[PDB]
Amino acid sequence: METQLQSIFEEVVKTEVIEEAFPGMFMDTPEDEKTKLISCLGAFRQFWGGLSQESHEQCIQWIVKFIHGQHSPKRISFLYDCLAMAVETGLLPPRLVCESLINSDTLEWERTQLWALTFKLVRKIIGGVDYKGVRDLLKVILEKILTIPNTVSSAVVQQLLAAREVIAYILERNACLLPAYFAVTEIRKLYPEGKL
Amino acid sequence: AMALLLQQFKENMCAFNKVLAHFVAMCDTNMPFVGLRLELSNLEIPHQGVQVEGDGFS
Amino acid sequence: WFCNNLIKELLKETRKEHTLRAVELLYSIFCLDMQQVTLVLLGHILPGLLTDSSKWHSLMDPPGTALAKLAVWCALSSYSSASTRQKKRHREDIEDYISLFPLDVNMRDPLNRVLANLFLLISSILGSRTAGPHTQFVQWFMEECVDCLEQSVLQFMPFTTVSELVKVSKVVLAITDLSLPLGRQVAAKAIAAL
Amino acid sequence: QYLCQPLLDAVLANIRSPVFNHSLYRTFVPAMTAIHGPPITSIPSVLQGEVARLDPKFLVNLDPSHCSNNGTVHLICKLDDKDLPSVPPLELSVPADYPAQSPLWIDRQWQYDANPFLQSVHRCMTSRLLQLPDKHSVTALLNTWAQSVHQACLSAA
Amino acid sequence: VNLKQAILQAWKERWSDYQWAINMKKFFPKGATWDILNLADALLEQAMIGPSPNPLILSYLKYAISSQMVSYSSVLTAISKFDDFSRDLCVQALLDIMDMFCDRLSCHGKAEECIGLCRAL
């Protein structure tokens, strides 16, 4: 079953070996981003509609560990666009994706492009979570931000700051994702009185 | 023996058929570099890819 | 001793409300001898907090924004320009500010020397690697230099800061430049290429 | 092993004594010194290597904007070739620790609109980018860019 | 030889914009960033002769802006020197050309080019 999803997603992003010898002579434009996304979304929709409810989440953990196992950032952003349209079309419940994205232990701050693209996608898809899920996401995002040192490199700081926009979006009072009392309760549980 | 893959090439006294001679020469001079690229990548020596070098004919 | 201990007692506050109140009080307390206090503050306390690698965990956002506000208020009020003990003691005092700040208008007036040295330090911090809380501090210092001014303390800013400040993230250019004919060239370079 | 074992047992028995090399000296140096006589009579340079070897089509220069002399570096290239048309300049973000990882192409979708031809350039370029192997160089990106421009010339006409 | 003759040959034999770019390169070995040779001026003169602009030479100018052949400063000056104003169609074409590069307006060059962009704005 994870073999099925393995064959699907690996057959999505295969790379051509014999190209760069006789470059561009093969008669075939490789599916550009939109057609490839539509085909990927269709095949994953087949596997998802086939899938059972209780098996709904271990496959998503496999998806996110397969995305975080990648190395090319274009590949990662393509599969994140796939996950974004898979949430946007209504196929996926928009809480499992966010939780398995953040609680993935491959998400460390040293993987700065993965950090930036991940928290960009969570900023995209957090608007649909119910408020208790937003509260638990707030807690795990704060605990993810808490692992950064006092000093980091001067180039990675802007890609690290992508979590700050998710935090600013959750604690924004006009957006009203959750009651603000819950937000200050989670914060003051993590930063009690006297802690910067 | 098994087939593995197939790709079609792009389109673009006449008894020579210059295009086929060109494709055969192109495969036979380019495809030695593909095995070298794989054997370099298995020992993780960073390299720019197989490139045309300076003039066109190399 | 006075200015250092009061700033230590600032920097161990953790609340936003108390830090802003402490700064609004400490300005008036430093108005006993504003000029000498600004020389100590922008010359000895702030370079020691920005240069020491162990110290800048004290420069976090709650006390740090307040401290940057107090430094820029002190700089402006000392530039634009008082008790009898303080008159006697500054008449007593001998120091060579040319020797203290060698630096790589008059520029023999010590406050211009302290300000030039501080802005060299700020450009060096913004230009370096290892961004931390001290970089947030010099960002805040330049932002309240922009906001607090009417137009000049920023006459002493090196023109490389114009480039670097938007490398580290409009009006913070167009105010900081002081608008000389060469100053437009650095302005138009930075504003168009944001 | 054979014919040499009791030496090995003695020396492996007597390791971690602080007077060990004293014992070896006292037991071995007079014999040897009697027989043998007395003793004896800013930018990481990988990127400079890439840029120094590029074809004169490309005209790679550093961005006036962006952080400089720090971890990652940023490039604005160009393209000069009579066969190829003038195209948007292209922006590259090379990480520090450049080999063992792949550089990133800063995407500017807005300038690759407003023409059909630049749209074809952009579609073909994203396609060849997806086709690329991992941990590719800068020159792989620049050559996929030039091949993308050439395909978008041919597909159009 | 002249830029007017090259643009006019580009109109005579129907050249698409990229073929115009290639043949414009070939006609002139020194690029001179194309602003010393005043590409925007010649293209605007021979585009704005009729009551409505011919879409060929407007396509040439829109390619020469979207591809970075011509700086925004020379375009904004050549737009500034048009007036006439009795024709709404040429004015709407000029406002679409301004709609292309405005809000972007980013010179990446010498500071004299940035001062030129200031005066052009």
Full DSSP string of D86-126 = P----EEEEPSS-TTS--EEE--TTTT-SSHHHHHHHHHHH
Distance of alpha carbon A29 from alpha carbon D121, whole angstroms: 12
Q: Which amino acid is at B21?
A: A
Q: Which amino acid is at D72?
A: T
How many C-beta neighbours within 10 Å does residue A97 have?
23
Chain A CB contacts of D112 under 8 Å are none
Distance of alpha carbon D57 from alpha carbon A16, whole angstroms: 26
Query: How far is the CA of C70 from the CAs of A110, C20, C32, C38, C145, in angstroms?
Result: 36, 9, 15, 10, 11
Chain D CB contacts of A73 under 8 Å are 102, 104
Residue A130 and residue A179 in contact, taking contact as beta carbons nearer than 8 Å: no
Distance of alpha carbon D140 from alpha carbon D28, whole angstroms: 62
Distance of alpha carbon A125 from alpha carbon A63, whole angstroms: 17
* Nearest one of C40, C57, C42, C150 to C95, comparing CA atoms: C40
Q: Which amino acid is at A76?
A: I
Query: Can chain D be said to touch chain B, i.e. do they have 3 or more Cβ pairs within 8 angstroms?
Result: yes
The encoded tokens of residue D134 equal 């991992």
* Nearest one of C119, C16, C106, C104 to C60, comparing CA atoms: C16
* Minimal C-alpha gap between B43 and chain A (Å): 17
Residue D92: phi and psi, rounded to 5, are -120, 145
Burial annotation A131-155 (CB, 10 A radius, 16+ → b, else e): eebbbbbbeebbebeeebeebbbbb
Largest CA distance in chain D: 92
D102/A71 CB distance under 8 A: yes
Distance of alpha carbon C115 from alpha carbon B47, whole angstroms: 50
* Nearest one of E99, E55, A38, E60 to D117, comparing CA atoms: E60
A113/D133 CB distance under 8 A: no
Q: Which amino acid is at C34?
A: M
Q: Is B9 helix (H, G, I), strand (E, B) or coil?
A: strand
Residue D73: phi and psi, rounded to 5, are -130, 160
Distance of alpha carbon D126 from alpha carbon B58, whole angstroms: 27
D100/B44 CB distance under 8 A: yes
Helix axes D116-130, A73-88, angle to 10 degrees: 110
* Minimal C-alpha gap between C106 and chain A (Å): 36
Count contacts between D and E (CB, < 8 Å). 47
* Nearest one of D50, D124, D61, D54 to D89, comparing CA atoms: D61
Smallest Cβ–Cβ distance between D111 and the set E26, E66, E108 belongs to E66
Q: Which amino acid is at E102?
A: C
Distance of alpha carbon C72 from alpha carbon C143, whole angstroms: 10
Distance of alpha carbon A6 from alpha carbon A4, whole angstroms: 5
Residue E53 and residue E93 in contact, taking contact as beta carbons nearer than 8 Å: yes
Question: Pairing relation of β-strands D91-94 and D61-62?
Answer: unpaired
C167/D64 CB distance under 8 A: no
E strand or H helix at A89: none
Distance of alpha carbon D99 from alpha carbon B40, whole angstroms: 14
* Nearest one of A150, E65, D12, D64 to C162, comparing CA atoms: D64
Q: Which residues contact residue D42 at a Cβ distance below 8 angstroms, ignoring those fewer than 6 apart? A: D69
DSSP E121: -
Residue E81 and residue E74 in contact, taking contact as beta carbons nearer than 8 Å: no
Residues belonging to chain E: 121
Smallest Cβ–Cβ distance between E26 and the set D65, D82, D117 belongs to D82
> Where does chain B break, by residue before each gap (C–N > 2.5 Å)?
12
Residue A114: phi and psi, rounded to 5, are -65, -40
Q: Which amino acid is at A156?
A: V
Among chain B, residues having any CB pair with chain A shorter than 8 Å are: 5, 7-11, 23, 26-27, 30-31, 33-34, 37-38, 49-50
Chain B CB contacts of A25 under 8 Å are 9-10, 26
Distance of alpha carbon D41 from alpha carbon D27, whole angstroms: 23
* Nearest one of E16, E9, E28 to E62, comparing CA atoms: E16
Residue D59 and residue D44 in contact, taking contact as beta carbons nearer than 8 Å: no
The CB-side HSE value for B37 (13 A sphere, CA atoms) comes to 18
Chain C CB contacts of A152 under 8 Å are 130-132
The CB-side HSE value for A68 (13 A sphere, CA atoms) comes to 23
Residue carrying structure tokens 């666009």:
A81
Q: Residue C18, class by beta-carbon neighbours within 10 Å (0-12 exposed, 13-18 middle, 19+ buried)?
A: middle
Helix axes E88-101, E72-80, angle to 10 degrees: 160
Helix axes C2-11, C61-80, angle to 10 degrees: 150
Distance of alpha carbon D2 from alpha carbon D5, whole angstroms: 6
Residue carrying structure tokens 């006075």:
C2
Residue E81 and residue E46 in contact, taking contact as beta carbons nearer than 8 Å: no
Q: Strands, DSSP E only, in chain D? A: 61-62, 73-76, 91-94, 104-106
Q: Which amino acid is at E52?
A: S
Burial annotation A100-123 (CB, 10 A radius, 16+ → b, else e): bbbebeebebebbbbbbbbbbbbb
Angle among Cα E98, E100, E102 to the nearest 5 degrees reads 60
Residue C12 and residue C62 in contact, taking contact as beta carbons nearer than 8 Å: no
Residue from C125, C129, C165 to probe the interface with A (highest A Cβ count within 10 Å) = C129
Residue A183 and residue A171 in contact, taking contact as beta carbons nearer than 8 Å: yes
Chain E CB contacts of C194 under 8 Å are 106
Residue of A nearest to B23 (CA): A22
Q: Is A195 helix (H, G, I), strand (E, B) or coil?
A: coil
The encoded tokens of residue E45 equal 């003169």
How many C-beta neighbours within 10 Å does residue C162 have?
21
Distance of alpha carbon C117 from alpha carbon C44, whole angstroms: 11
Burial annotation B5-26 (CB, 10 A radius, 16+ → b, else e): eeeeeeeeeeeeeeeeeeeeee
Angle among Cα C112, C115, C117 to the nearest 5 degrees reads 110
* Minimal C-alpha gap between A120 and chain C (Å): 19
Q: Which residues contact residue B55 at a Cβ distance below 8 angstroms, ignoring those fewer than 6 apart? A: none
Residues belonging to chain D: 157
Residue D131 and residue A19 in contact, taking contact as beta carbons nearer than 8 Å: yes
Angle among Cα E100, D123, A158 to the nearest 5 degrees reads 70
Largest CA distance in chain B: 51
How many C-beta neighbours within 10 Å does residue D11 have?
12
Q: Residue D10, class by beta-carbon neighbours within 10 Å (0-12 exposed, 13-18 middle, 19+ buried)?
A: exposed
**Helical segments of chain C, H only:** 2-11, 16-30, 34-40, 46-51, 61-80, 84-92, 97-100, 110-127, 133-148, 160-167, 171-174, 181-192
Q: Which residues contact residue A44 at a Cβ distance below 8 angstroms, ignoring those fewer than 6 apart? A: A5, A8, A9, A82, A86, A91
Using CA atoms of A180, A185, A186, A188 in order, give the dihedral in degrees to the nearest 10: 120
Residue D93: phi and psi, rounded to 5, are -125, 100
Distance of alpha carbon C81 from alpha carbon C66, whole angstroms: 22
Distance of alpha carbon D100 from alpha carbon A101, whole angstroms: 25
Distance of alpha carbon C183 from alpha carbon C152, whole angstroms: 15
Distance of alpha carbon D78 from alpha carbon D62, whole angstroms: 11
Distance of alpha carbon E26 from alpha carbon E36, whole angstroms: 17
Distance of alpha carbon A68 from alpha carbon C66, whole angstroms: 41
Residue A94 and residue A128 in contact, taking contact as beta carbons nearer than 8 Å: yes
Chain D CB contacts of C194 under 8 Å are 65
Distance of alpha carbon E116 from alpha carbon B48, whole angstroms: 41
Smallest Cβ–Cβ distance between E108 and the set D76, D86, D156 belongs to D76
Residue C74 and residue C30 in contact, taking contact as beta carbons nearer than 8 Å: yes
Distance of alpha carbon A28 from alpha carbon B10, whole angstroms: 8
Q: Which residues are bridge partners to D94 per DSSP?
A: D73
Residue D85 and residue D149 in contact, taking contact as beta carbons nearer than 8 Å: yes
Distance of alpha carbon D8 from alpha carbon D4, whole angstroms: 7
* Nearest one of B58, C169, A75 to D136, comparing CA atoms: A75
